[PDB]
Write a protein that binds this ligand. Structure first.
Ligand SMILES: COC(=O)c1ccc(S)cc1
Length: 460
């Protein structure tokens, strides 16, 4: 039975509003309702992995697991295996996979981050799960960020705290946060970003939604605007939104948005908003295609509607050769020519590079680069032709061209990372000097760039 080169992944996010679900929620797992929906002809085809994020979840883990498993069994006639479940307060993540994947999944990690301080510590934060699927690392983050139309900056801060402190994936990747640890990272939840229009425009917004005219609302969506200004979710993707705002509804219908200020809302307006979102970030040149992104129409227990997204994701096999794993394959090498880092820093320490990849036996430290002054005030760290020759464990191009090199640029003085990025080995040619590039981030903010040339030697 051959190893897959593609899997499909279901991502669900639902703020349950502290209410039990209705008896039928199959529409969610079938990607049926509004937006980019799944074709009817696929309804019996199981996804490989289902990742369910809930917020304001009033159920026990046992209660929700029974509903989820019985839901998927009704749809697919398959009894899914539980990979992981993790709850922080009323924020929960469940990972279910087809039984045939049980011996393809390993290195399961779970963690949570609590956001805020004092007042603002106690119900917001994130849960996450990571694991290996054969040769491919997968990470999943469900976050419930700070609420309220006037707190977009707090939401951005919550995002930076979650990506700094959530401890998932390979702990040997010590310079790298979750935004660099996974082949594919999915980040979803009640992100709580709002449509930033005046309160007086509530009925106008409702009108627009009834006409399915979302353009003038999406142009004021705080997540889209904050992402365009590079304030949050830098280098993440989101599918185009073609479904109605998923918040705030009157319960037990979808006919009414409940936006007016009430004691129960702290006297805050809740204009219709896309609170409930799915974003992703995959390593460069890895296949990832969003095949659905929408909301259900028929699950009305909460003041939020469930959101679904599905993806085709490229995966690789657990490669064995005669040589690696457990030695190098001298027929393979990675060389770097004419490389330089450009850093936004005001500092003047010397810098060196670290190269991390599962195609290496362990990470590789470079020599210090040569600091020059850039013509516009920047720091340019020149490596020229000084970078070490990297020795992969396997030389077969079917393996090596699918790999990635993570780069950290570190201060000689403190050994702290000033920037992290990633280079694909999916090159146009081998034995050929070719341009490489990655932006560099630190705590998920832009700190610079790394560029130069690469020359990859494989066994072919
Ligand atoms: C800070 O340490 C980590 O990054 C980490 C990652 C994964 C697992 S399972 C455990 C710990």
């Amino acid at each position: 039975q051959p190893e897959p080169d593609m899997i499909t992944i279901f991502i669900g996010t639902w703020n349950m509003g502290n209410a039990p679900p209705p008896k039928k929620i199959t529409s969610w797992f079938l990607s049926k309702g509004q937006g980019k929906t799944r074709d009817d002809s696929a309804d019996y085809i199981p996804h490989d992995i289902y990742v369910i994020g809930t917020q304001e979840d009033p159920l026990s883990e046992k209660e929700w697991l029974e509903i989820l498993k019985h839901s998927l069994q009704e749809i697919t006639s398959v009894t899914f295996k539980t990979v992981a479940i993790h709850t922080l307060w009323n924020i929960r993540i469940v990972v279910l996979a087809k039984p045939e994947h049980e011996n393809r999944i390993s290195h399961i990690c779970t963690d949570n981050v609590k956001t805020g301080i004092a007042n603002t510590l106690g119900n917001k934060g994130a849960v996450g799960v990571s694991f290996m699927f054969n040769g491919t690392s997968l990470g999943f983050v469900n976050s419930h960020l700070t609420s309220g139309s006037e707190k977009k900056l707090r939401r951005n801060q919550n995002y930076m705290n979650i990506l700094r402190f959530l401890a998932l994936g390979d702990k040997k990747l010590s310079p790298f946060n979750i935004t660099h640890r996974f082949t594919h990272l999915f980040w979803f939840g009640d992100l709580n970003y709002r449509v930033d229009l005046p309160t007086w425009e509530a009925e106008t917004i409702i009108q627009k939604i009834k006409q399915q005219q979302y353009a003038d609302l999406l142009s004021h969506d705080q997540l889209l605007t904050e992402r365009r200004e590079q304030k949050v979710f830098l280098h993440f993707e989101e599918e185009e939104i073609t479904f109605a705002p998923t918040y705030r509804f009157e319960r037990l219908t979808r006919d009414k948005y409940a936006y007016t200020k009430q004691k129960a809302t702290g006297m805050k307006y809740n204009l219709p908003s896309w609170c409930d979102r799915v974003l992703w970030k995959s390593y460069p040149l890895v296949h990832v295609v969003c095949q659905s992104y929408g909301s259900t129409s028929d699950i009305m227990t909460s003041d939020h509607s469930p959101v679904f997204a599905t993806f085709e994701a490229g995966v690789t096999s657990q490669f064995v050769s005669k040589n690696g794993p457990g030695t190098v394959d001298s027929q393979g090498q990675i060389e770097f020519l004419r490389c330089y880092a450009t850093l936004k820093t005001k500092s003047q320490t010397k810098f060196y590079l670290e190269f991390h990849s599962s195609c290496l036996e362990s990470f590789v430290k470079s020599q210090e680069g040569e600091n020059e002054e850039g013509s516009e005030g920047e720091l340019v760290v020149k490596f020229g032709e000084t970078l070490p020759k990297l020795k992969p464990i396997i030389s077969d191009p079917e393996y090596l061209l699918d790999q990635h090199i993570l780069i950290s640029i570190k201060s000689s003085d403190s050994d702290e990372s000033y920037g992290e990025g990633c280079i694909a080995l999916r090159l146009e040619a081998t034995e050929t000097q070719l341009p490489i590039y990655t932006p560099l981030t630190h705590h998920g903010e832009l700190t610079g760039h790394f560029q130069g040339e690469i020359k990859l030697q494989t066994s072919q």
